[PDB]
Amino acid sequence: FRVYSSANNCTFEYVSQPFLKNLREFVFKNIDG
């Protein structure tokens, strides 16, 4: 149920507390990392 792809070796972990007549706007960008 949670298989994107195999051969994953991420060591770093990160944030929680998930994000979610219903216009969901969002935006994504990168700035020097």
Binding site: T11, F12, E13
Partner: protein, 49 residues
């Protein structure tokens, strides 16, 4: 249980406040030798990993 000398157990410490001050409370420390840095002012610095 600690690992062998050849299979030294490695752990990565990232995204966490490092209280390098509770590193104490563990032993009188047969050795506590710091190279390139000082044992006291470790709380005056910030690193990546």
């Amino acid at each position: 249980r600690f690992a062998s000398v050849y299979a030294w157990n490695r752990k990565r410490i990232s995204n966490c406040v490092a209280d390098y001050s509770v590193l104490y409370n563990f032993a009188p420390f047969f050795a506590f030798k710091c190279y390139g840095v000082s044992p006291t002012k470790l709380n005056d610095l910030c690193f990546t990993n």
